[PDB]
Backbone as XML, in Angstrom:
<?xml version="1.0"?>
<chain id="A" units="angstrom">
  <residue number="1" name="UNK">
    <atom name="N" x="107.886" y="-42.758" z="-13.858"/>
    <atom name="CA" x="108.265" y="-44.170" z="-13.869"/>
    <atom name="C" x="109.438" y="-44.444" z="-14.789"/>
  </residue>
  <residue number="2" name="UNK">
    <atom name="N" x="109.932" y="-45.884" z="-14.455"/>
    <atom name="CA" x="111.407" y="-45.915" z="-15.520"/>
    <atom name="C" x="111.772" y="-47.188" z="-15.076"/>
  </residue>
  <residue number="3" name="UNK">
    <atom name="N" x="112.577" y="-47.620" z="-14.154"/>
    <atom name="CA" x="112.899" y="-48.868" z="-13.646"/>
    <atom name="C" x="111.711" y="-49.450" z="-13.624"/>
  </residue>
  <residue number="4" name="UNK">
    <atom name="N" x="110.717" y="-49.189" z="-12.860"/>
    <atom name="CA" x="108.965" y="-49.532" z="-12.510"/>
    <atom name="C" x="108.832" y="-49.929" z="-13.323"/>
  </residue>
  <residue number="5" name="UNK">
    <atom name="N" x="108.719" y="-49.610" z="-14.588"/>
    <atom name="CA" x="108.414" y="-49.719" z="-16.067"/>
    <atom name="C" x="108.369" y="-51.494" z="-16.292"/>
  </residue>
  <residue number="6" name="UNK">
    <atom name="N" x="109.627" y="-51.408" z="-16.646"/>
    <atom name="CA" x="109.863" y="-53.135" z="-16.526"/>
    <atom name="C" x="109.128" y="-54.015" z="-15.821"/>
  </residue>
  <residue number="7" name="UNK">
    <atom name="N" x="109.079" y="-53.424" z="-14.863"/>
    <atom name="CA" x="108.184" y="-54.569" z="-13.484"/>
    <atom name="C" x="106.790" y="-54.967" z="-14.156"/>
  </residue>
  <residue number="8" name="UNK">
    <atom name="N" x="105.979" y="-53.356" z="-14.297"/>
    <atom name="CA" x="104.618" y="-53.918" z="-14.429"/>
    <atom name="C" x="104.024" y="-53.995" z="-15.688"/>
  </residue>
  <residue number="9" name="UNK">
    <atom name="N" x="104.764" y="-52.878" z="-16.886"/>
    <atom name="CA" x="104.170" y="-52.947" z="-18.635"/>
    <atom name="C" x="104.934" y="-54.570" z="-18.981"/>
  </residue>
  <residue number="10" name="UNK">
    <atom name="N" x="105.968" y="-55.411" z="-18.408"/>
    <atom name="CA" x="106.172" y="-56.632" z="-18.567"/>
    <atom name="C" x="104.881" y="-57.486" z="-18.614"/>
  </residue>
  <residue number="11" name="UNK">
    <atom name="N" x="104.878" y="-57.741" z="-16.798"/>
    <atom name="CA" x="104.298" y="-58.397" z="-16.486"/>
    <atom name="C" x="102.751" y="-58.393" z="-16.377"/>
  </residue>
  <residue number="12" name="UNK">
    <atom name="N" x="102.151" y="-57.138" z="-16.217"/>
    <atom name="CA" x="100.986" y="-56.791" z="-16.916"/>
    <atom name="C" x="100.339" y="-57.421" z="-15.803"/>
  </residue>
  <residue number="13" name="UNK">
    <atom name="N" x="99.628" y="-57.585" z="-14.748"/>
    <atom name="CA" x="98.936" y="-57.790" z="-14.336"/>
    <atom name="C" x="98.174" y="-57.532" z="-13.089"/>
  </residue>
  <residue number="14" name="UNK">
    <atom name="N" x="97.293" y="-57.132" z="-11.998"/>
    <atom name="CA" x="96.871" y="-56.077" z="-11.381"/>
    <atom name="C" x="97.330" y="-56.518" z="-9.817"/>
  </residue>
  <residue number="15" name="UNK">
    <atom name="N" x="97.094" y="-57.754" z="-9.502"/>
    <atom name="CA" x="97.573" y="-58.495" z="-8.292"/>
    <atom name="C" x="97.529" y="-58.207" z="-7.411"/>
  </residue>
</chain>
């Protein structure tokens, strides 16, 4: 992961 990163350790949530 790397770009991904940002997306989901940001936003944190399972959805």
């Amino acid at each position: 992961l790397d770009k991904e990163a940002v997306y989901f350790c940001h936003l944190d949530i399972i959805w």
